[PDB]
Amino acid sequence: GPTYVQALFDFDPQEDGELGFRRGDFIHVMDNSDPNWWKGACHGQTGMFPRNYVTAVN
Amino acid sequence: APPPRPPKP
């Protein structure tokens, strides 16, 4: 099943391809091969986000 | 303040 994380902090994209989100958002983790920047999806957008802004759900 | 953006690889 898909892995989900939940946002601990609001994140405003600064570069192309980054995924924005607000606290409480559930993000589907699509790629966690890098220890710092993961690829995720939320509400129909996908993009890279900082792992230190989220916490594990499942 | 929110945490610093980590290094891009």
The Cα–Cα gap between A26 and A44 comes to 12
Centre a 10 Å sphere on the Cβ of residue A42 and count the other Cβ atoms it contains. 19
Contact call for residues A9 and A23 (beta carbons, < 8 A)? yes
CA distance linking residue A28 with residue A43, whole number of Å: 10
- Please give the CATH number for the structural domain made up of A1-58: 2.30.30.40
Residue A50 C-alpha from the chain's centroid = 7
> At A37, phi and psi to the nearest 5?
-115, 120
* CA pair distance A29, A47, nearest whole angstrom: 10
**Experiment used for this model:** X-ray
Distance CA B9, CA B1 (A): 23
Resolution (Å) of this entry:
1.7
- The separation between CA A30 and the C-alpha centre of its own chain, rounded to angstroms, equals 9
Chain A positions touching B9 (Cβ under 8 A) are 34, 36-37
B5 Cα to chain A: minimum distance (Å): 7
